[PDB]
Amino acid sequence: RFLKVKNWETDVVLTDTLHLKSTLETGCTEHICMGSIMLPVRTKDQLFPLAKEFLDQYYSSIKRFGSKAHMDRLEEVNKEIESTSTYQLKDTELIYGAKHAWRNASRCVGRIQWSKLQVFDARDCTTAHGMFNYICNHVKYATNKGNLRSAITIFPQRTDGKHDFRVWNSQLIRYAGYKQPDGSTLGDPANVQFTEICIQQGWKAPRGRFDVLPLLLQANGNDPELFQIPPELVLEVPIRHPKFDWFKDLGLKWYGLPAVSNMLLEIGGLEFSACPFSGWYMGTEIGVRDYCDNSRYNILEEVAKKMDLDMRKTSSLWKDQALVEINIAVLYSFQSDKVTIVDHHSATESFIKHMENEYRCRGGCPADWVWIVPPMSGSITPVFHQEMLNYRLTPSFEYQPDPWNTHVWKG
Amino acid sequence: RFLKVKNWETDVVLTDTLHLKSTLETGCTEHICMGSIMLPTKDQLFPLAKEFLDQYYSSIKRFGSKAHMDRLEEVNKEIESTSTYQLKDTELIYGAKHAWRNASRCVGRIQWSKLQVFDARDCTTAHGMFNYICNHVKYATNKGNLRSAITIFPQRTDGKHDFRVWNSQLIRYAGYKQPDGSTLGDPANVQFTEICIQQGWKAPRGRFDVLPLLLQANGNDPELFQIPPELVLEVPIRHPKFDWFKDLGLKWYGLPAVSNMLLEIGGLEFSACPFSGWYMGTEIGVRDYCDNSRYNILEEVAKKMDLDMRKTSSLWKDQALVEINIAVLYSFQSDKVTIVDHHSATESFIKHMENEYRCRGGCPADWVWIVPPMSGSITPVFHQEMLNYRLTPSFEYQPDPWNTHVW
Ligand code: HEM
Ligand code: HEM
Ligand SMILES: C[C@H](O)[C@H](O)[C@H]1CNc2nc(N)[nH]c(=O)c2N1
Ligand SMILES: C[C@H](O)[C@H](O)[C@H]1CNc2nc(N)[nH]c(=O)c2N1
Ligand SMILES: N=C(CO)NCCC[C@H](N)C(=O)O
Ligand SMILES: N=C(CO)NCCC[C@H](N)C(=O)O
Ligand SMILES: [Zn+2]
């Protein structure tokens, strides 16, 4: 069965056959669409099919499907499974796996870049200190003095579920939040819970508005341990505006490296619970969401105050005016300091080209419209007008529960 | 089967049970989400009628009364006898209000129970239709103080005697392709504009010509009529800061009146049911004015503003967009024509959702349509999880009649 998507701006119609390879469920039924819901110990049994499906896809990608090398690999994985109950990926299969998880990430607008990914194999890692060293190397390589390079570091896979490797941070680099006694928050409200854990684990918090968090790292199912990323490895950008000279006096800055570290990478039925990955920012992530969400830094009022906009009626669009100026500032600051960033016009246009190419070469491109359309100026970006099909392919990045909810403390 | 929706900004969680009453299908399966796709007999009729009458009698606290059973009996007898049935006025009104209440793409539903329902089921000709429509236009416009209204023409019979308004809204601007290669006026209306011309309309061939009505009664060939211009309230667009804005020569109409949809109540199909409320500013200023395939004015506005149009990263498009939208709102307000900004409308809708969850067990909503096309995440609906599903009575899409009609 063939499925059509249409772009309502261009009338370009595309045909999807890739969705036929989809296994994992969506959350939707014939009676309910859950397309806007944020979040809608494996046995030998289920494992060999998952391995096989993956190795068939790998061997096809390399034009060796059905070859002796393909068949010997299936056989060797099969024996390894029923003997040791799991298996190990070859380096080439891991790299391919990690790239495809990104290729298949339906909420990622940056996927035109999917094949340029530096994969760091950290499967020989055994301790939290080993992890810290790996993560430092990743930050330094990815940062590259502002000329950002996509990378992923992959710690050992899950075994019995009791020896998991985890990065407790939700991103490698992120700012602390501190609920105050009067009920206000200092710093980033998204990171209050995790900040409170670090403090409990013995971090001495500077208690400012932009304190880079320490890494809280769990190796081999052991209690996690704290480490400070050397400050010389943490690239940051002071935020100023090309025209408004008071803008710098808001005291704003952000870090250049967006490094999601709390997701789970599934490849061939194997579960890599610590797999921090980074690219570079689209300006709206910081300018729209991190700065202007009500539950984040929430700077809209203070900015609009300085701009002396009419704030007594929403229909002045004072919020919308302030929002553009803030986003101009983020992009200007990053460009001026020569740190990679992409604007939402450039990034969405690239994605449409990516998506069309994928339909031609691959038979489809799973995409989550709710996430792909940028959080400001939605309909003046080409994605708003693009119909999309969302379905789940493996290899994949998946959510997992926060480790503090599940971890059995050793003491 | 009992479903939670979370607001990620406020942490408020709502439990949805209303979805279990869902009748129609979404387009989605467990393998594929189609959430962003625009368009995803006697035997048939009695279940649909029963389901509707049951919810009606429940709504007036008479579920299982003799008057409930008697009406079920009487409708049943009438379908058996005539293969269709007629709604009582009270059922018609209830059904239309509920079709709006159920409209998952409508952000304006806090208003759902204040709807003036005009019963045009006695209408027989296109002239009749024109009369009913002018009355609706005048009623709803109300010299700028807009009132929600719907006008309901006769229900489908054998599908060869359909009433249709061929226009997509009661009031829209014409579109003409020129030698040029380009388009004058509204590109969305080019083909319908041609149909009018080929039917006999003398087009003034300008940028903002109000189209004629093309009206189909009882399955006949449709007929042209001009709405008295005195009934079409329009707003010149100026900006409260930029004097040059008026020189762009932009205007829009006050009454948004969708006329191409199909109202289904208790299995009956009302193929001409034009309805109107009032505008949210973004519909005009973001979509109608700035879509590349609509009036597409971003570039002219940005030039007038002397912004750096060399690079997308200067956010010149975004800057022009905000100002165009300030100008729309300012102009409607200055002229006392009802309009709502996207902050106000989305705040109301979040309140409406809480009311519906509390009093009804849920509120079908399509997040893709509900989130404004500008400044999405600085409105509260962006952060609101929504469940989309189909309840009846409903408004449904139907194919444009020119592909259907036998001349
Ligand atoms: C190279 C530049 C990249 C850009 C500009 C980019 C852009 C983005 C953006 C804007 C989002 C949404 C973020 C949010 O709203 O929180 C995102 C999500 C995501 N991207 Fe990327 N991306 C990039 C690289 C990568 C890389 C290297 C990977 C993994 C190898 C990746 C995988 C993801 C995943 C899994 C998500 C979903 C995260 C979630 O659900 O929280 N992307 N991308
Ligand atoms: C009172 C003021 C109202 C406001 C502010 C309003 C707001 C809106 C908006 C912004 C849309 C999206 C339109 C688009 O993007 O093209 C919409 C869609 C819709 N509304 Fe309303 N609405 C109002 C009244 C009504 C009324 C009176 C009805 C019917 C009785 C109705 C039924 C619908 C339907 C069926 C749609 C979806 C149409 C489609 O899919 O093209 N609304 N509403
Ligand atoms: C409820 C809703 O799904 C939620 O707010 C989503 C909307 N779209 C998003 N899109 C992106 N890219 N990132 C997000 O965090 C969200 N939040
Ligand atoms: C492809 C996508 O579904 C389409 O562009 C939608 C997106 N959201 C929308 N939302 C509203 N209110 N109106 C629209 O016409 C659209 N168009
Ligand atoms: N561009 C990326 C990954 O390359 N996004 C990662 C998520 C970052 C999050 N949205 C933030 O604002 O910190
Ligand atoms: N507010 C409404 C109906 O009350 N919108 C209906 C569709 C109008 C269309 N979006 C337009 O911009 O002309
Ligand atoms: Zn869906």
The secondary-structure element order of chain A is EEHHHEHEEEEHEEEEEEEEEHHHEHHEH
- Tell me the CATH topology of the largest domain in chain A: Nitric Oxide Synthase, Chain A, domain 1
- Biggest contact: A-B, 64 and 63 residues
What is the radius of gyration of chain A computed over CA atoms, rounded to a whole number of angstroms? 23 Å
Do you know the CATH architecture of the largest domain in chain A? Alpha-Beta Complex
Number of domains of chain A: 3
How would you characterize the largest beta sheet of chain A? 4 strands, mixed
Measured by DSSP, the beta-strand proportion of chain A falls in: 5-15%
Cα-to-Cα separation, first versus last residue of chain A: 55 Å
Bound molecules: protoporphyrin IX containing FE, 5,6,7,8-tetrahydrobiopterin, (S)-2-amino-5-(2-hydroxyacetimidamido)pentanoic acid, zinc ion
What's a concise summary of this model?
Chain A is an alpha+beta fold.
Structure description:
- Two copies of one chain form a homodimer.
- The first copy, chain A, is an alpha+beta fold and 411 residues long.
- The first copy, chain A, has three domains: 16-123 and 150-160 and 264-278 and 348-372, Alpha-Beta Complex (Nitric Oxide Synthase, Chain A, domain 1); 124-149 and 164-235 and 399-403, Nitric Oxide Synthase,Heme Domain,Chain A domain 2 (Nitric Oxide Synthase,Heme Domain, Chain A, domain 2, Alpha-Beta Complex), CATH 3.90.440.10; 236-258 and 281-346, Bovine Endothelial Nitric Oxide Synthase Heme Domain, Chain: A,domain 3 (Alpha-Beta Complex), CATH 3.90.1230.10.
- Helices cover 33% and strands 13% of the residues of chain A.
- Chain A has helices at 44-61, 68-84, 91-103, 128-143, 192-201, 283-292, 300-306, 318-336, 344-362, 369-372, 403-406; strands spanning 3-6, 13-16, 118-121, 151-154, 166-167, 177-179, 185-187, 215-218, 225-227, 236-238, 253-255, 259-260, 264-267, 270-272, 277-278, 281-282, 341-342, 396-398.
- In chain A, the strands form seven sheets. Chain A has a four-stranded mixed sheet with strand order 3-4-15-12, sandwiched between helices. In chain A, strands 5-8-9 form a three-stranded antiparallel sheet, covered by helices on one side. Chain A has a three-stranded antiparallel sheet with strand order 14-13-18.
- In chain A, a hairpin with a 2-residue loop joins strand 13 (264-267) and strand 14 (270-272).
- In chain A, helix 1 runs antiparallel to helix 2, helix 6 packs across helix 8 (318-336) and helix 7 crosses helix 8.
- The termini of chain A are far apart.
- Chains A and B meet through strand 1, helix 6 and helix 8 of A and strand 1, helix 6 and helix 8 of B.
- One 5,6,7,8-tetrahydrobiopterin (H4B) sits between chains A (8, 384-387) and B (36, 38, 368-369).
- Chain B: (6R)-L-erythro-5,6,7,8-tetrahydrobiopterin binds at residues 36, 368-369, 382.
